[PDB]
Amino acid sequence: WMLKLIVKNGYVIDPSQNLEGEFDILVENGKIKKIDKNILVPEAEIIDAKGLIVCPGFIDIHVHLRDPGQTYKEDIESGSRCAVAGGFTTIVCMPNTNPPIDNTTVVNYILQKSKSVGLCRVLPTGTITKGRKGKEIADFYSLKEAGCVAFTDDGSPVMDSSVMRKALELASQLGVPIMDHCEEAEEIQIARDGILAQRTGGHVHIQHVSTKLSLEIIEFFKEKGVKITCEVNPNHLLDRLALIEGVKRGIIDCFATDHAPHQTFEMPGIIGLQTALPSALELYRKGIISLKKLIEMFTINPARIIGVDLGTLKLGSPADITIFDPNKEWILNEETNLSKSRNTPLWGKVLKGKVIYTIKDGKMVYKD
Ligand SMILES: [Zn+2]
C-alpha cells in the first residue's frame, strides 16, 4: 500500500483535453493529481512508460458477455479479462442475456459479479421491451435507477415503429440513448430512427452500418442537429470502402467491437475485445486517421454517447489509464486468448500493437 503512482517517460495523448506530449502522470488516491514534465515525489510506485503511448482507458459500448445464461460462451470474468488485456477499463454489456436485462434483479446481479471480478467497469443496458419480446415498453425509470446506461433490443429490433417512438420519448426525459440494429432495410430503419429521433428529441445510436447511403443518411441528420451517433467495429475493416471513408470524415463516432462469443458458427459476428487496438492501428499505419483521432474513438466519443465522465485524463478523473506499444508483434492463439471462445478471422495472424499496462482506479489490472 502506497497511495501514489507515477507513469514516467511516455508520450501522453488525451484528445479530450487537446493534450499531446512527453509528460509524466501523477496518480493519487484512485484519481489523477498532476500531468507535467519530469515528476518525482516520495512514496510512489514508478512505471517506466518509455517508448510507449499513454492515454485514457478505452471504453467499448458494444460487448456480449453472455452472462447470465450462456456462460460456456463467455462470462463477466473472462469478458473482463479480455477487456483489460485489450486496454479497456469500461465495457458496456448488452441485454440479450437469459434472463434478459429487463428487471432490477438482473441489473443488480451484473453489477455485483462485476465488483467481485475486480478488473474493468461493467455498465448494464436494459432492453426496450419486457423480455425483448416486442410489445410492451419496459420500466426505464427503474432500470436507470439500478444503473442501466442505455436501452436496446439487440437482436429482435423494434419493427413496431411506434414502440421505437415511445422508447425515444422516455429515453429523452431520462437523458439516456436508445441503441438500435444488430441481428434497403438498413437505410429505411436508420432514416426512421433519425426522423423519430428529431421529433422526440431523444438520442438514437446506430449499432450497424454497412453502406454509403446509411452513412450519408446519418451525416444528413447530424448536420440538422439530430442526436444520432454510430459505431463501427474495427476488427471488421480487416461499401466496406465507404466505412473506411466515413471514419475519415468523422461520421462514425466511435469504435465498438460488438464482441460476440459463439461456440458453433456454421451475423453471427466475432470476438474482438483483445484485438480491437492492433485492428484500429492498421488504419493509422496506412494514414487513414491520426493517433489522436484513433484514441478519440476509443475514449471520449464513446464516453459522450453513454453520457459518462470517463475517457479523459483531466486532473480529478478516475485514473483509468491504458498504456500501449503500437509497434509490438503478437499472435492471438490458445497461448494468449483470454476469451472462452475462439471465433474471429484474426486467429493466428500477426497483429501489430499490444497493450502493455491497463490501470483502473489507479490499480494495475493488467500487465504484459
Ligand atoms: Zn450486439
Swiss-Prot record:
Enzyme class, broadest EC rank: hydrolase
GO CC field: cytoplasm
Reactions it catalyzes: (S)-dihydroorotate + H2O = N-carbamoyl-L-aspartate + H(+)
Positions bound to Zn(2+): H62, H64, D154, D258
Pathway connected to this protein: Pyrimidine metabolism; UMP biosynthesis via de novo pathway; (S)-dihydroorotate from bicarbonate: step 3/3
InterPro entries from the UniProt entry: Amidohydro-rel, DHOase, DHOase/Allantoinase_Hydrolase, Dihydroorotase_CS, Metal-dep_hydrolase_composite, Metal_Hydrolase
Complexes and interactors: Monomer. Forms a 1:1 stoichiometric complex with PyrB. The complex exists as an equilibrium mixture of heterohexamers, composed of 3 PyrC and 3 PyrB subunits, and dodecamers. The complex has both DHOase and ATCase activities.
Role this protein plays: Catalyzes the reversible cyclization of carbamoyl aspartate to dihydroorotate.
Protein name (Swiss-Prot/TrEMBL): Dihydroorotase
Organism: Aquifex aeolicus (strain VF5)
Gene: pyrC
